[model samples]
Target: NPSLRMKWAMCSNFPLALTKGDMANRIPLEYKGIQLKTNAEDIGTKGQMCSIAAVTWWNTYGPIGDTEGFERVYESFFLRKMRLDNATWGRITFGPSAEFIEMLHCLQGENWRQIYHPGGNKLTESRSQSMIVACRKIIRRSIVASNPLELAVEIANKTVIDTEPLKSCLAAIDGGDVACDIIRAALGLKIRQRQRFGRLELKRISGRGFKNDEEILIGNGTIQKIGIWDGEEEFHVRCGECRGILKKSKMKLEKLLINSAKKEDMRDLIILCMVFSQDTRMFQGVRGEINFLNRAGQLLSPMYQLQRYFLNRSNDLFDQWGYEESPKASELHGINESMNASDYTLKGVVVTRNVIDDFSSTETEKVSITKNLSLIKRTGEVIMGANDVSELESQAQLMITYDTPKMWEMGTTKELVQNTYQWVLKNLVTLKAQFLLGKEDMFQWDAFEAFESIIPQKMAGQYSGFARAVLKQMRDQEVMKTDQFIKLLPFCFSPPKLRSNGEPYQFLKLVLKGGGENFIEVRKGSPLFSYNPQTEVLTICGRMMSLKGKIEDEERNRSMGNAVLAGFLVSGKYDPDLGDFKTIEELEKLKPGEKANILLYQGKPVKVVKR
Candidate 1:
C-alpha cells in the first residue's frame, strides 16, 4: 500500500543522438556484441537462429502437436479441477470405495459429460468423458480393500502389464512377424507340456502357490521336462538293456529305472530336457526357487493377461450401469462378471508381490532386524538360490524404515500374511515372464497376446507324461544321444482331436563332453539350432526364424507354414580343462598327434564331443 498510485501511460523516445553515437560512450567496451544493436537498429534486422526468440522461445513454448495445442487451449479454458487426498500407501490401501466415489464426483463436476462439443463431435466428448470416469472407478475398486498385500499385488501386476515394453508390443500387433504366432504357439505347447507334468507329478511336489517355496522347484522350470531312459546309453544309473536276453520285467523296469534315480540325476534330466526342447539354456546362477516361480508365472501369463482384460472390461460395464456419476468414467460398459479374472486374463506380464507373514513371526519390538534376515538369508539361499543374494542384502536395509518400537503396535497377523502373499505374487509374475514363454526380449512380448488361450487339458496331460518319462530316462543314462533325447517332443500337451497339418511335435538331443570330463558344467553357455518335428528332421532355429518346410525351402518363408516346433533334446560338446566349446577349438589344443574319441549326435550342426 506504500505506493498504490499508478497510471498506464505510453511514451515515445525521441533521442537527440543516433545509436552509433550513443555506442561511443559504452561503459563496458568488452561487451561489444551487445552494443551492435540498439532499439532502433535492431528493429528491422532479422534475429539469428540461435537467438532467444528463434531458439529458446520455440524450444520452451512450441506446440506439442496439431491437436494437442488446441486441446491444451480448450482444457485451459473449460476443463475443471478436482481435489486429491494426500494418502500414504497404507492408508490408500485401506480406504473404502466411497472415499473414491467422492473424489470422482468432485473431479467430474455436476454434469459428468460435456453439454457442448469443444474439441470436435459432441458424442466423442461424451464417450471420452465416460471413459475417464470408468478408469477412476477401477482405480477405486482396486484399492477399496484393506489388504495392502492385495493392493501391492494389484499395483505390481499392473506395473508389469503396463510396462513400456509390453505397451509397445500391444501397439505393434499389425506389424509383427506372421510366423511369430506359430512360434509362440509352439512355445506355449512346450510350457503346456511342463504344466501337464506339474499336474501329473503334482502329488510329488504338492503345495499351494509359491508361499511354500519348498515344493516350487520340482513344480516349475525345466524340471517338468521328464524323460524315460531308452535303455541304451552310458548314464549314471543303468537302464535295463535293449537286448531281449535281459527281459527286464515291468517291476524290474520300475525299480531299475524310476524309483532309484538320484534326485540330482532327476533334476539334471528335467533341466536338460527343458533346454533341449526349448532350444535355450537356462541363464546360469539362477536359483531353483526363482527358476521355478519364473517359469510357472510365464506359463500362466497368457491366462493372467486375458483375465485382466476381462476384469477391466467387465468393471467398465459395471460403472456404465450407473447413470449417477461413478468413480471410473473411462471404462467400457456392460460385461459378464460371472467369469473369473483368471478366465479372461491372457498374456500380460506376470506379477508377484512380497509380503511379510505376521502369523509366522511372533516377535515385533523385541527382535532385531538382523536376526530375522539371518533366518531368511540362509534359508532363502539354500531353497530360493544364489540369485536371492541381492534380495537378502536389500532386506537388511529395509529394517531401518519398517522396524520401530511404537510401529510394532500397529502390526497384525493378517497384515503379515497379506504382505507375504503380496511378495509371493510379485515373484510369481517375474517367474512367469523370465522362465516361460522364452520372452527374453522385447520382440518376444509382441509375439504374444494379452488374453490368449492356453493349451487344452488333454493335450497338456500327454505332453506332461511324455516329458516326465524323457527326463527320467535321461537321468538314468549318464550319456544320451541327440535323437534319444528328442523322443519327448509332442506338438501340444492337450490332445484328443485327430492330428492334421497343425499337429505339433517335439525334438531332442544329448551332447556329452569328450575326454571323460563332466559335460554339464562345461557347456555352461552354448546352444544353437534344434530339431524340427514337422519335417521329422533336425533343423535350424532362432529368435528371428524357424525352419518349417523341407530343409531346401529354408530360404523361401515356406516354413512349414507353422511357427511352433515343441519338445526338443540337444547338446554341445567341448573340453572342460581347456575353455573351448567349438569342436575345432578342442581339436587345436590336443598335444601333437593326440588321438581322442569324437562323439557326434545325429542332427543339424552335428554335435562332436572329444573324449
Candidate 2:
C-alpha cells in the first residue's frame, strides 16, 4: 500500500524537470549582490546553469545540507545558450559570485565540451515522439492471446534497431544484448496494466492527445465515464507498461528529492539505481531505468564521471571482441603475470612468467597450464599464478588423490596407486601426497624417501580415499568449524570455476579514497591519462593536476578531467584500452599495500608506484 501510494505521487505530482530553473527554484537560493534576470536571451540559459549547479550541490551534499552561503550565478545569453545551441564554445565571461560561477562552470569543464553535443533537447523530444509511435504500433499489432513480455521484446528490438534516439540511448549504456532486458520490462508493464484495469482500447484522435480526455465504461461500473488523457500530443504515451515503470521509478526518485536532508536516502537512492542498472533480472522499464540513471549521473558529479568510466571500460571490452589478431604471449604474460615468482620452479626448471588461466576467455590458448591443473584439482581455491613446480606438485597430488578411487574402480591395485602418487610427488618437487583406502585396507606408501618426508607422514584412510583425506584435513585444522571456511566442503573434486567474492562497492572505495592528484590527458583524439598513487600525481598529455575529494561532497574546485580521473582510478580493468580485467578478486588476493600502485588504463592495468 505504501509502495502503491508512493508510485502515485511519483507519476502524478513529482517535479520531473530536467532543466536548471525548476531545480534551482526547488531549493532556496538567497544571496546579496546578485540579481535575477528574466530577459529572453538569459532567462532560460542562466536558469539552466543555476539548476545544474543546484542539482550538483543537492546530490553532492544533502539536499538541505551545506547550503548556508550558496549563491546563483549567471552569464550572458550570447555566451550561455547561443554557443551551446550552435555546438560552438563560448567561455563564461562574467557572473555575480565567483564561487558559484566556478561551481557551475565545473559542471561543464573541458571534458564536457568533448562529450556534450548541442542537440540533447532535440534528442529528448525525438525520443518522446518515437516512444509514442512505438507504443501505438505495438498496441495496434498486438494479438489478444500473445504474451506481453514477448511482444514487448520484439517491439523493443525493432525500435532500437530502427530508432536513432533509442539506439543512441542503448549505446549510451552497455545495452548490447540488454535491449531485450529493456523490452521485457516494457511488456511487463503492459501486462500489469491490462490485469489491473481489464481490457482497454486506444481511440485514434484527430487533434492533440494529452489535452483530450474522455471516460468510458462497459456494462456495470462505479463511474460511467472517467477522463483519460492520452499523451499523443505531448509525445509522452500513457501506455500501461511505460506508465507503470515511470510510476515506480518516480516513486523512488521523489523520496530521494524530498527526504534528502538525511544523506542516507540519497545514498540509498544512488545505490538502488546503480544496482537496478546492474541487476541481472528482467524488469519492465529499461528505458525509464536507464533514463533515471543517466539523468542522475549528469546531475550528480561522482556518478556522472563514474558513468564515463563504466562506458569506457564497457566499450573497451566490446572492442576486444573485435580484435582479429591474437595477442602475443609476451603481452598476455606481461599484463597478467606477477613478478614475484622468480624462484618458482616447475618440473625442476625455473619458470620465467607464470600466468593464471583465463577461464572466461573464448580462446583456449589464453588458458594457462597452471589453470588447467587447478581445474583438474577440483578445488574452489582459484589457483592464482604459479611461479614454480611446487604449486602443480600439490595440484597433481590432489588430482591423483581423487583419481585413485576411480582408478581402483577400474581394477587398479593399491601398489599401482602408491606408485602413481609417489612417482608424481618425486618428479613434482615439494608435492605432498595423501593416502587413499579401498574396501577394508588403506593404500600404503612407505617406499619413497622423498614422499615419506612430506607432512602428516601418514594420512588416516577411509573407503572414499580423497574425500576422506580432505575431510580429515579440514577437521584436523579446525578450519571447517571456523566461519571463514565453513560452507566450503574443504576440497571438492568436481569444483565449479573459482570467482572473486569482491563487491563492486569495494571497488568504489578504491576510486573514491585511493587517488591523490588526478588528471586527464587532453589530446586531440584520446581522453586517457596516467595516475601515480605514491606521488599522488596524474600526468595527462603533459599536464599534471591534483585529485579532489574522496566522497561525494561539495568539493567544487574539481575539473571535468578530475572527475573523469576519479572514475579512472578505481576502475578494475588492467587497461581501458585493452579491456582486460585486473579484477578486484585478484587485487584482494594481494596485500592492501601491495595493490596501491595499481591503476586501470583504458580497461587494462599498469603499475606506476614502486613497491
Candidate 3:
C-alpha cells in the first residue's frame, strides 16, 4: 500500500484554539497549565467533537520550537519505565495519525533489538531475558492488529526500525515463506500513470535522508554510492610567492628603526608595524638584535629631568617583553578592591577615560567601570575624561608630592574643611609665600591647621556661634543632655589649653564643675570669657576690666560669694577680655586686704597668696 499522506495545517506561532467540547471526551494528562489531551484526534481537523466545550489549552503553551519543553514531554511518555504492551497506544493518539504511528514504531523498534537476542553465552550477555519477554508481548500485538499488511509497511518506514530484523522476524512467522510473501505484497510497487510515461517521484524524510537527486533502483543489486556534480567544472588551487616580498619588507623595517631618533618612535614601530603586520616572523627575529642599538643621544639640557621621569615610568607598558617592573594595572585593581586613605594620594585619584577604557578592556563590562568610578568619587577624588590622559599624569604627580600624608588626616568630605583648604591655598598664592620655606613652602602648614580646627557645621552659620545655636535647639528638643553636650564640645570647638603641669586649665576646670544651663554659663561671676581657645587667658585678673562688676556683685552676697570664690580658686583665673591670665607678677602686686576683699571661699574671705 502507498504511504498515507495526511497534512495538518498547524502554524507553530499561532494557537490551535481548541474549545471545551473539543477536550470533553479527550483523555486529560497532567502538565503544567496546559493539559495535553491524550487523544491527538481529539484536537486535529478530524477531531470528533465540534462545539461541546469552549476553552483554549494552547494559550498558555509556547511554540513547538521550544525544544526543551518538547523533549521533556517526549521523555515522560517514551522513556517511562513501564510494561510496553500495557500502554494503550489508542489512548495517546488516533492510531491513523502520522505522529501516532511514528511514536508507536519508534518505541517498538528500540524494544525489538533488546527482545530478539538474549546474549552470546560464555562471552558476553548484551540483552537480558527480561527485555526479551517485554518486547515479545509488544511485537505480538502488532502482528495481531486489524490491518497487519499496512502496519507492517508503515513500521518499515520508521527510522529506528531495523529492516533486516523485521524481514527476518516475518520470514520466520507462518511457515517462513508465506509471512515473507505478505510483507512483499504490502511493500509491492507499481507504476503510476505519470510515472509510466517516464516521470519521477521524490520522497523527503527528516534528518540525513535521501537527497533530492538520489536515485533508487528496483533491481537485485542496490546502489551504495553515487558521484555528484553541480555543473561542468573541475576544482583548482593556486599559490603565490611571499618569500621575495618578506625579504624586502625586512630591509625597509631596518631603515625605519635606524632613522628613528626617539624612544616613542621605536615604541610605535614595534607595536604598529611588528605586532599588527601580516608577517610577524620578520619583526620577532630582529627584535633581539635591535635591542643592542644605542639611544640617539639627543637629550636636551632643558628637558633632562622631565625626560628621565618619563623613561622611569614608561617601562610598565613594555614589561610584556620580559622586563620585570612594578605592577601598575594589577596593583591598581588590587588596591581598589580594599580602598584606604593613602590610596587617594596615589595615581588612583584622577580617573581618566584611558584608565576606564583599559579597565573595561580587561574586565569586559561598562558596569564595573561605573562602579569603580563611584567608589573613587566617594573618596573625594576627581574623575577625568579619556582625553585627559596627559593632564591626569601631571595631577597624579601633584597629589604624590603635596597631598599624601596630610590628605589621609581628613576623615570626611565636609564642606567647611573643603572651603578652608581652598581659602588657604588662595591666600598663599596671593601673598607669594607659596614657596617661602623652600620646598616646604609649597605645603602651607598654616592653612592645614586652620582647616583642621574648622568643624563642618550641621546648620548654616559660622563656627562656635552656629554650633551653640544648634546645640540649644537640640537641648530644647530634649535630644541632647548637658553631659552629652559637654562630651561633644571638643568636636565643635577647640578645647582650652591645660595648666603648665598638664592638668586641665583653671578656666576649663571651673566650667566643667559649674554645671551651668549651657557651655557659656561659666561666665557668671567668673572673668569675662571668650570661647576662642587660642585667645583665652589662664589667670583670675588678666582681663579684670571685662569682668567689670560681675565678680564685684557676686562678692557682695555671702552665700553667692562663698560658692563663686571657691570655684574660682579651685580653677585659678582667666580674663576673656584681655586674652591673658593674671600672672604671678600681677597677683603678687595685689595688697593683702584687697585680694581678700575681692573674694571669699567657704564662709571666709579668700586671699591670693604669693607664689
Candidate 4:
C-alpha cells in the first residue's frame, strides 16, 4: 500500500510478449499465433474466426507448475547416523538372546568345571584356562557396574567406540572350520559327555569344490582331526577378513559368514558390529538403497531386511568376541521390517548406489538398440534350414543378405549417425559367436571388411560422424554398406514416419550407403558350424518371447484380408491362354521336363500345359 499510494512520477512498463511466452508456444491451428493475446483471450471467451483457431491454438504442450528437499533430510539423517546423540537415540537393547547368553554361560560353566575336575590331561586345563581368560577380558571390556542391560547399553550407544582398548580374541581352535563345526564329535550337541574332542571317524574331505575350500582346507590338506567343544551348527567367525564389492549391484553374503552362521546369535552379533562402529570395526558391508531397493521404485528394504535376516547369520566375523561392548547406537532391522519404526531416535539414511545407477545413468552413447531379442529370433530362423529337393536332408548354407525391399531396409551404421530411425537395423550384426544358442563358426565375405573400422566413440560428440566416415571409407574400398533391393521381402510397415500416402517414408535409402550385395553364410552341419562356444561363465541362456496377438481387436481383420484378395483379383494372376497346372517338383524330376512350359505361381516353379 505504501508504494501504491506513492504519486511520485515513476513509470513502469513490462510487455506481455516479453514476459508472457506464447501459451501454446508454437503454431498449430493458427500459424500466426495471436491466441495468447487478450484480444484472442476474448475470442476464446466469445465466438468464430480467431475463436475457430483459438481453442486448438490455446492448447500447447506446456508443463504445469514445478518441484529437492531430499538433500537436506538425507544429509541430516546421515549426520544422525554419524553421531550417536543419546537424547532422542537410546542405547541398544537385547532380546531373549537366550542362546547367546547360554553360550557365554556355558563358557563360564565349562571353564569352572574343567579347572575343578582336578587334573585330567592338562591340555583340557590349558584350553579351559584360555577360554576363561577371554571370558574375563570380555567382562572387563563391557565396562559397567553390575551390568546386563547397562552393559548392552554401553555397546549399543557406542560413544567411546572410535578409540577403545578392545582387542581381537583368537579362538583356541586353529582353523575357521574348527570354529564353525567342531571336530566331528561322535555324540550330538545335547549328549555333552564322553564326546571325542579331536578326531574324525570319517575321512577329511579331499577339498574339491568351493564348499570343501570353506570346510577345512585353508592352508593345505586337513592333516589331523584338530579340536572341538559341543559342536554347534551356527559358529561365530571373524571379521575384517573380506569385504566384497557391493556398489551398483548386490553383495556377496559369502564375505561375512562362512555359510554356517544362519541363526540369530551370529546375525545379531555381526550386524551389531556394523551398526556399532558406523562400519568402522565390524564387517564392512554395503548399506545402500540399491542394495536394499531394487529398480521399479518398489521399496525392497523389507525383502532385503529378510535377506539380511537369513543370509546375515553367515560366518560371524567380529561379533562381541572382538568388541561387542563398543558404544554405538543402532536400531533393529527386524523392527524396521516389522512395520514399526525404531522406537528410539536412531535415524540414518543410506544412499544406495543401485538407486544411483537407476537414476543417473544416460547409458553413455550405448548399444545402438536392444535388438537382442530380435537377433535371437532371426538366428533361430537361420538355423531351421529346411532341406530343398535339390539337396540331401544333410545340410544347407544359412546366409544373411542386406539385399532386401524398401521396408525390409535396416538402416546402416551411417543411418545411425544421420539421426534417422534405427529401424531395428542392428539385427544383422547379431550373429555374434559369443551370444547364441546353436553357435557355429561364422563365415564372412571379405566384404565384411566394411565393418572393420566402425569404432564406437560413445564418449565423443562426433560418434555419429565417426561412424558415417567409417562407412564411407568402406565405400572407397569398392565395398559400401548398401541395401539390397530384395523387392521380394515384406514391405516395411512401421507405425512411425509416413509418406504422401498418409506417411511411412524411406527405409532402403541407408542400404544405398552399403552398396551392392554382401553375404555372410555358414553351412549347417559343417565342421565350422560345430563351435560349441558355451561355457560355465557365459552359459547359452535361451531367451525367447511368446507374444499373444490382440486377436479380439479389429473384428474386421480376416474380412479385411479377403477384401485385400478381392482387390488383387481385379487383375488375373495367370496369363490368358495357358491354364494347366502341375507342381515343378515333378517336372524337375526328369529330363523330359524341358518339353513342358514352366510358369511361376507365387514365385514357385510349376509345370504348365498351354491351352
Q: Compute each candidate's TM-score over C-alphas.
A: 0.16, 0.14, 0.16, 0.18
Using TM-score as the measure, the top candidate is 4
Tens-place lDDT per residue, model 1, 213-330, is 1111221243322222222211112111110001121111111112212333333222222221211112111222222122112232221222222222333322222222112222
- The whole-model C-alpha lDDT of candidate 2 against the native structure comes to 0.26
425-462 in candidate 2: lDDT tens per residue? 23332221132112211223222222222212122111
Among all windows of ten consecutive residues in candidate 4, which has the lowest summed lDDT? 383-392
lDDT (Cα, tens digit) per residue for candidate 3, span 422-496: 343234333223222223232234344343333333211223332333333333422332221322222233332
lDDT per model vs. reference: 0.24, 0.26, 0.26, 0.23
Once fitted onto the true fold, the runs of candidate 4 whose alpha carbons sit more than 4 angstroms away are 1-611
Please report how far candidate 4 places residue 504 from its true position, in Å: 26
Tell me the tens digit of each residue's lDDT in model 4 across 205-308: 12111111112121122221211111112112222221111111011121121222223432343343233222222222222222333222334322233233
Error of 2 at 54 (Å): 22
* Best-fitting candidate, scored by lDDT: 2
Model 1 RMSD, rounded to 1 decimal: 31.2
How close to the true structure is residue 477 of candidate 3, measured as C-alpha lDDT?
28
lDDT of 2 at 6: 65
- The number of clashing residue pairs in model 3 is 11
Q: Give the TM-score of candidate 1.
A: 0.16
